[PDB]
Write the structure tokens for this entry.
Amino acid sequence: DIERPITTGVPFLLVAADARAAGLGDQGVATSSDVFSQQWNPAKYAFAEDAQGLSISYTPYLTDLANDISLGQVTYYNKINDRSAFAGSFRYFGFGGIELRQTGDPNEPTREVNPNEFALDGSYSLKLSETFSMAVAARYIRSNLKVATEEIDASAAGSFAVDVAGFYQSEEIAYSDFNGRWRAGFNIQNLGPKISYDHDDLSANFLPANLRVGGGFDFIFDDYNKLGVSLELTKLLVPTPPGPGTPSQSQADEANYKKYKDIGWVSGIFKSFGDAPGGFSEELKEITYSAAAEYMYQDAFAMRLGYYHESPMKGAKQFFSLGAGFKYSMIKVDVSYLFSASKVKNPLENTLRFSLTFNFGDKYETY
Amino acid sequence: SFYVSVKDKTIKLNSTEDVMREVSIFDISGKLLYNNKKVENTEFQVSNFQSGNQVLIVKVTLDNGNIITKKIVFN
Amino acid sequence: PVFYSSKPSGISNDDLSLNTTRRIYSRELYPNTDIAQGQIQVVNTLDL
Amino acid sequence: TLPDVEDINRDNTMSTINAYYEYSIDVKPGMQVGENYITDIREVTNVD
Amino acid sequence: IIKSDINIKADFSLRNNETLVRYLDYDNNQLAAGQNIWSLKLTADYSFSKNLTAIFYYDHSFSKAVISTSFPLTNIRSGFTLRYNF
Amino acid sequence: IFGSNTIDVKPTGSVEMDLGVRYTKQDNPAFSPRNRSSLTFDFDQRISMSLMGKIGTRLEVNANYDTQSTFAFQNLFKLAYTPSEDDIIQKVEVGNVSMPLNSTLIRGAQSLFGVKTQLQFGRTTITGVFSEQKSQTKSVVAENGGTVQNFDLYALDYDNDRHFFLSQYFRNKYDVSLKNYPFIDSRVQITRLEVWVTNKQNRVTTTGGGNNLRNIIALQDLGEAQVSGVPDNEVVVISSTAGFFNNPIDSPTSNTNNKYDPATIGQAGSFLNSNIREIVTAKSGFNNTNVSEATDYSVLENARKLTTNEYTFNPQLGYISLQQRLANDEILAVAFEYTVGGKVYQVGEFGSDGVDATVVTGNNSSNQAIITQSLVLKMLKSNLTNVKNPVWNLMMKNVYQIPQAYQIKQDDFRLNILYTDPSPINYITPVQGSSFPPNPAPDSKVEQTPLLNVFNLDRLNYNNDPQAGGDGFFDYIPGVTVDVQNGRVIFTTKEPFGELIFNKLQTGAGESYNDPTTYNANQQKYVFRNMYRNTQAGALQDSDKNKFLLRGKYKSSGSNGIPIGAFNVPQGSVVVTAAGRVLVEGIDYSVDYQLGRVQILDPSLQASNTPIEVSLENNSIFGQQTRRFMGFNIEHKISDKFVIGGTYLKMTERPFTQKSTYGQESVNNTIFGFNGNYSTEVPFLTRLANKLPNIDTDVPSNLSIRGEVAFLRPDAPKASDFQGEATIYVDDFEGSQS
Amino acid sequence: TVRFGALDLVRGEWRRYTGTLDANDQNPDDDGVEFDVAAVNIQENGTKCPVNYVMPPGVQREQLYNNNTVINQNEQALAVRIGGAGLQYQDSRAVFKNVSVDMRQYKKLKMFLHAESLPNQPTLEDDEMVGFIRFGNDFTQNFYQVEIPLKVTKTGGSCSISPDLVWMDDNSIDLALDLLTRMKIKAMSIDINSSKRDVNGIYYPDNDPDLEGGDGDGKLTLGIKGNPNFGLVRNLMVGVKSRADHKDIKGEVWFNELRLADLENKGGMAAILNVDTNMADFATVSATGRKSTIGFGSLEQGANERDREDVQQYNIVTNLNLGKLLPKKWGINLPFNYAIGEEVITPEYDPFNQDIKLDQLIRETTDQAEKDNIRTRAIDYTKRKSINFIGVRKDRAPEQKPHVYDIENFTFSQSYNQVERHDYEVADYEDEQSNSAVNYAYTFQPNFNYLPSNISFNTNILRQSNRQQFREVEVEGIGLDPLYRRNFAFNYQYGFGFNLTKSLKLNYSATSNNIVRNFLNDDNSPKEDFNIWDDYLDIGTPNQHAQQLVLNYDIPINKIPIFGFVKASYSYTADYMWQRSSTAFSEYEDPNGTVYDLGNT
Ligand SMILES: CCCCCCCCCCC(CCCCCCCCCC)(CO[C@H]1O[C@@H](CO)[C@H](O[C@@H]2O[C@@H](CO)[C@H](O)[C@@H](O)[C@@H]2O)[C@@H](O)[C@@H]1O)CO[C@H]1O[C@@H](CO)[C@H](O[C@@H]2O[C@@H](CO)[C@H](O)[C@@H](O)[C@@H]2O)[C@@H](O)[C@H]1O
């Protein structure tokens, strides 16, 4: 099972917040540009066909057990030129309003709490060459899951992070049986200071710094039927905490945890590439990969299939994903479903994601 | 009609008029922390349960078969 | 928690390092107990 | 905000019976597991 | 370029409650329960389009403590709700 | 790939987004100053989308997304790809799909989410499905309408801390008064009862029967006189009874029976002084010496009076039934009044005839004196439990709560008593080397006697008239043996599994029910004295006596139609079986799907008493394991009247963890089978029908033959296996030590 | 300063067994033995000084997702500490749990065990303390006994000891329940007074000189006392026992992962045959035959829910429209329904002993009469017969004037049901029900009026007969005396509505319930040879009689031209009921011998 998992703060940032990418095995770093291209690769907002767009996404949790426990995302982008784009997003995980009814009197005034976690980020993407673009994103993260009691401090914990991303999209290149198009991208995410959940520097958690690299290829048939195959690789940029021992019995473990927790996040990024007694073969074990296929009909209907595979030693979150998309006039509707193939229960099992995006403004020609 | 109250690590269920048949208390992970198939009361107190993990989901099966869901904070 | 997070006037870091006043974290008492991120990580000790 | 009352179980009445069981624990520097109801001892070496 | 009527609906409520137990033979008027809660719900509507509607809301409730077992509570909920019809 | 190029999937509904802030400030001074206020961002989505349309006249979309729906199944999404008839692929479905099967041994599934494909090779139809099952199969049994609910209660599982005799007089009169039930050998008529309990709610309200709070002192021995067959130490706790009683031996319970009479407090020779009326001086209020604060009496300072909806009482047999049981240190005290013909007896002190709550002397607060006086009541439950005191025996142990039963009726209730050692046997056998008492009375027969007769629950026929050996059925007496409104069964003796069976097994006068060392080795095996002389937890230590089983059933109908215990049942998932044959959904019965009501339409089955089994899919489930449903069905067609099938199904549950605890197991079952269907038309049968005297019909005669064989290959999933073997944990010991 | 990182009251699901286990001592509350039951945690006892707590080899902590984070669950073992004066030679201390466990579908019962010495106490030696499982329906009369001498983990040096040395495979209980079955079958031949039995009555096959092979397990000592049943375990007990003769021993013993293994996953089969035919809208026949074997079941059914019995069932339902055999010029509706079916169920396990398969017990009996009794008492047989004449009426020809004396205003219904059963609990069961109903209704079509607006009347004869003969499970020689329940009733109710005036309206209704007691002797003894058709058209004594009268009046005061503004409306409803009292009241006999009629209500 899971051995020596990587411990990071605010793990809700790694959850796929849109149905389109979730239907593609939780990957978007090298897919076609879309309104949700902020969590995955802000650099391809400069390749958007529409001038601006606004999207709303809903990812419910524990659907059979309760309602209003969900991860919500609102994204807005607006590419002012054919080379630059401005984008902002708001991911929000909350349990909904919870009534703190202490006594049993029906009419007693009750305090309502809404434990929640949200991230507000804005990105600027600039198209350097006709096929390459880069982006920089600044994110504010706030964690407010704790509820105030006589002993518990419920002060929200906050942190800031920056993202550096790049997107490559080649021109339509003709082949023997079709005319394809190549895509690639990278996204270094959540680069920022440690988040102190208990407002103490001695107890700080690494931000979920993450590196996504990926490539995509589009099969174009009859200029109206498109099949897109994308592969994504993901690696956390957080050092792995020690397990058995690597210097009494508990003294060695305590010293190892002391050394692991006394690492800066900038230094932790480089310690991620290593910090293990194994070689390259055993450090490739920490690499998460995801494969996806997407068939497009008239650019208004999409069928999405994807496979996501984490290492069984780290998280062990592996599943198959199915997705569908419909565009009426300017409304695109995306739904996705997850089939888990892992020993550990996936909290998003038996859950249908919903995404709704509005496209308006001018149209930009694709190169 | 249905009220759930937590005073000191104790959960009190108050379902006026209607009789509760079963109560299942879940931590917010899908994990069942407490289940009682034999409540049969209009008021029930979960005194043999204590977790301290803040947010809990109380699902109550009524005698009619209706299922009432309430989210609580385990003070 | 005000003594540990927003230190009041007249309280120093030395006052918070005694084994009678320092904040006790759950990992010290329960190194093998996993706690969800964003949840309670400190042990609220009853002090006599 | 509650008034101080000589009624702790909040049944409006003040009990005056002293029928109870007694248990005691020694507090001394050299306590070890196996005596004085001690079942486990955890040593912390270098605390931040 | 966009013309719309603004609908304002303001709902204020002030509720007072007191439970007193009175002794007949001596001055022992005991305050057993009470509530002093006032609330204000203000909403403003604006139709940016036939499909798109924006509503501003502001809910402010303050409950005073009548007896010490209750704590004074302030609840303020304000923001914008955007509704799009299909 | 699609018929045309049109795409007309038009969204319907609305989307709402809440963007705002939430501010909260509760002024609890115990809270940290860091917790003085909460300022959180508020976000909310209220999607109520609907999606309908087509893509190229071949793909159909039917989706509905609502964030405020039920658990998971109201968010439907159906993709249906229907190509032309000449293609091998006939129909592909993705999303909410169903796998209906025309089979009795192998049932299909209606609530599935996955991929369903249908193939046609000339005349052979192949239907394959891979999906996740969102529903759970539920089966109910109905006879004469209402659903049948079965119960099993062991002797130890009585309704504890709820039912109390009002006095030792009623307790000791109970057995003899019910000897010739339904006739009650007692003229006791309880006219008035006031019940007081420890007040922990502490709420003043004018609608809950007013604000009647009083200081209370509850005396264990109040109103008690001697009992002929019972020693005085088993009736009263007073250390010395010398000069205590002042009425004849078998006098009915009344205030004037002893020197604790509230009416004679401190007159000339009472055992109580005026100090008894004050909480502070309660101890000094006793004239007798050895008095303890929780044995002889108990005090409450703001005791709350129960309203009439919080309890019921039996006016004739002198006991009470609380709505809420007192399983904790609560004090129970009562005042009651009853008539025996023209005579009126009172045992407690009512608010109407008791001392005033408050007496004030003086003119102002500087010199005023406040005297708060207590009502003297009869203690039915003490603050501190002591099973050696008679107040413990006031608690009835002979009342059994039928689970889930609220409106039980005669002809809708069955009860039998079994001895399970280990199999259920409805008679008692003597211990080897011994015999039951010779030549017993007909009412004390034990040898070869059904246990209902042994425990005095079957002496009447259907019309409640006495019958020599009974009618084999539980005597349903609304006033004696059952509590119809609450669905409780009450034995006609106070200790049916104790003193009653001891008496029926007694062989000589040298054996005493209160002396276990004198038992005759049949009483050693069968008499469960500890369930009456000890608490239930304490009686758990006597592990070999909890072998008598109360077993039966009752019918819960309520309204017309069979209640199947599920709402919004998926269409086509209901199967009804009468006597091994499957009924027809249009002829024999009708289904109200939204309310979960099954109505039997066949007139012969309604007036039959035959047990009707109803199976259905329940999609109102939560906290269940992920259920994978997959399989294929073959539908070969030799001729227009002969069809063969080849169904094969597999279902696997995904455990939450690798440790499957007992009861919460996971299955990996595989089922497969074959079916045949031959349906011909026989003109000969119609021709023979026309040969009958007055038949002139022309409708055809049809013969239908259906055969099916099924094989089940069950297993457990590899996930919940320990060292390569299917494993169920009786106790992994993780759930102990809360 | 004392700082409590934790401070709890801890309640355990396992209860210390108080009272005696060995008959040689008979003094539990003495001898100063400190018996402690607790739990040892990976989360709290990873640094325990005698031995660090570690998971048994192969055991892993459960893993769950709390909020996008992996949470390792706690792993716990039940710890038993024996201290103070120490255990005597044959003394034992145990904890128990009340459960409901069926382990017939599994082949192995397993548990991990650990033993260690107490610090500052004499060292516990190997095979001196014996861990034991005792389970059954109790701990004194009906239980299996599984014992294992315990090897002691060597302490003294480092507190961190390898899991293979904390949880020795030599100390693990690995029990095959087939060995328990063999032990029980062998103990069937050991009487309770045998010298082969222990002082506690436990039969130990390993201690039997005349038996070769012992209990079939060289690692475990197996015992049995009184026919327990692992098909329904109501009592689970683990504990420690001593074998050190001249020594008082102290130590700590851990129990972990008590589990069932090796699921018996052999399946089953079922077959269904359906024959449906119709005879030109006159007769329809539906026949069904069902055969299922042991191990069959539904897809969703678990190990303990699948079929544990062979089932053979047939059912034939026949419907005839006998009214069509008559000329259609007068319309007779005469539907005839005939249903017959029987079901035979043979259980996998013999109902006696509940945990030995029926065929195995039959084979290992060596007594022909006992073989026949065992074979016959296990059969669950049900036979059902249903004859129905519901809805008999004469239809109206398409043009006649309705008349009050018409036979078209009548409806007749007759239902007969019979159930014959015999199974492990009843040697002979017969349930007979007969229902005859006649309905009449006529609506009249158009000083004060006296012609009724409508007339209603119906009569019901209901006769339920029940015979119950509980079987003797030991021998099929005589059996219990049969019990008879009879519910012969005669019901009739009538009602007529009136339109006495244009405003005044009168409705009357009366119902009567009669009971027929022809089946009772002079005393309160039912007659043995009483047929359900004996005196069918017999009206019995009245049991319940009720009357209802409804009056509606509009108060025609508007006729006079001075009170025409009044709109009065008067309604009067009256109810009466007479209820026969029980014979216990109407013939009550006081102890002095006088018989009193306490009357009705
Ligand atoms: C940070 C994001 C803030 C939120 C942005 C909202 C933008 C609202 C503009 C409405 C809109 C976008 C669709 C949005 C709907 C999604 C709502 C989802 C709610 C989820 C709960 C609908 O327009 C479409 O929808 C139809 C609705 O029926 C319209 O019909 C008609 O609609 C009405 C005539 O407009 C009729 O009155 C109605 O009779 C008809 O029916 C059609 O005209 C059209 O198809 C059209 O956008 C256009 O309007 C202008 C006006 O200023 C906007 O100017 C921009 O403002 C800044 C950008 O805000 C930019 O910086 C700035 O450069 C630029 O000047 C542009 O946007 C422009 O392109």
